[PDB]
Write a protein that binds this ligand. Structure first.
Ligand SMILES: *CCC(=O)N(Cc1cc(C)no1)c1nc(-c2ccccc2)cs1
Ligand SMILES: *CCC(=O)N(Cc1cc(C)no1)c1nc(-c2ccccc2)cs1
Lengths: 244, 244
């Protein structure tokens, strides 16, 4: 398969030298191959066809210089040729939509853009629920997190039911679908397919997202993801480079 | 004193009827007189000179009809004559700056807009620290929390230093200053004034904000706040209306 978004780049760890300046006409993304938050920014970079370079960070063996890019020391981080630094996944995405030509991913109408960010707040419990699920050390907690996923998914299902469209922003794919897609991409890999059983609109939305040229171009092995997760839970510095 | 921002509107609780329709040409804000998140929105409405009505909600005796305005049941909530509903304090603020004429609070530049949202993220722990401090029961935790307020304020001081500006978005007041002001406004009332004396620019920024005409128009009694606070921690249905 063709690597088209930093998929083969080995992560930089403690003791690595800081990368050189960003070439003019290019925007660098500090990312990690399996990070869903960094995936929002990679999805936007492709959807808008922006020329970019990807530097992967080893999140379980962080380079000291990475804290100079983001004091929070989290991915994604964007760095342009001017040395301007933008972090936080939703800030990176909005910035890209605003600063670069190509398909406009966010509506200009202030109310419609406000609906997209309100939908994102309705989604906000899903990443914490994913965090709890992966860490569950008992069959009981595990089964109860599955019912909890149904309750959150239903709230997303209602948005589609009211808007009467396939995607969260309308007839065509927009910013909001790309911002929430990274967690839904892994439901099969997490054995959470059953949690979309009573949400038909969300099930149809998932199939439509998997057909999108941007979404499809970034899909990787579920086994690479699962192997990464095992190593990540173990606090391994080999997690981020799993499968390379 | 002249009440220009919902200071004299008795809060609506269980058993009260929801307000009438929003007059055309006006916008309604569902608020609470001492809520720092809804105060963000009230500051923006005043600064941009927007015609608006303030409806106060009794947060310790919440009408079930209010969950139809915001499913999270939180203030602020904006409601217009078209029936559109906007919630989440930073969402209501950006919406108002984009939809209405008057003073522009957000900068035109995409990167400078990004910076404002990044500074908002650096400030993000302060509301939770304020919540913990007001619930303190021992001397050790009270001292420990002051050390944490100091460290977070140092992060804000670094911004004003690196920028070489009086305000967070430049040499003039902008969106970012109004978004964070509601917590600094209460430091004297919480006896936390000493937590900013190791951050010279922060202390000067607070003095400058105090002088701002928009800030001064929304100023309330330090004792009304403290009295509201005691009742609020007791979950009293009379908290929201203290002073009225
Ligand atoms: C870029 C983010 C990332 O790679 N992380 C860090 C993170 C995010 C959250 C919610 N917690 O840490 C990843 N974290 C996981 C994860 C979360 C919780 C438990 C195990 C694994 C996968 S990627
Ligand atoms: C509009 C919201 C509001 O009035 N809150 C709710 C809230 C927000 C946070 C971070 N915690 O509660 C208020 N809550 C307080 C409060 C609660 C607990 C400790 C301190 C202060 C005052 S207003």
């Amino acid at each position: 398969s063709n690597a088209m978004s930093g998929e083969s780049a080995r992560s930089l760890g403690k003791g690595s030298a800081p990368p050189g300046p960003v070439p003019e006409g290019s925007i660098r993304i500090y990312s990690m191959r399996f990070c869903p938050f960094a995936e929002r920014t990679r999805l936007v970079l492709k959807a808008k066809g922006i020329r970019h370079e990807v530097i992967n960070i080893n999140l379980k063996n962080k380079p000291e210089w990475f804290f100079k890019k983001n004091p929070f020391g989290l991915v994604p981080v964007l760095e342009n040729s001017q040395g301007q630094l933008i972090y936080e996944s939703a800030i990176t995405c909005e910035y890209l939509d605003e600063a670069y030509p190509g398909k406009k991913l966010l509506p200009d109408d202030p109310y419609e853009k406000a609906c997209q960010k309100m939908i994102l707040e309705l989604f906000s419990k899903v990443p914490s629920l994913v965090g709890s699920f992966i860490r569950s050390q008992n069959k009981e907690d595990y089964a109860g997190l599955k019912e909890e996923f149904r309750k959150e998914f239903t709230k997303l299902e209602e948005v589609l039911t009211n808007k009467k469209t396939t995607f969260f922003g309308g007839n065509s794919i927009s910013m909001i679908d790309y911002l929430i897609w990274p967690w839904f991409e892994r439901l099969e890999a997490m054995k959470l397919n059953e949690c979309v059983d009573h949400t038909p609109k969300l099930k149809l939305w998932m199939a439509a997202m998997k057909e999108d040229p941007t979404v499809s171009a970034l899909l990787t092995s579920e086994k690479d993801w699962q192997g990464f997760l095992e190593l990540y839970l173990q606090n391994s510095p080999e997690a981020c480079d799993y499968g390379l």
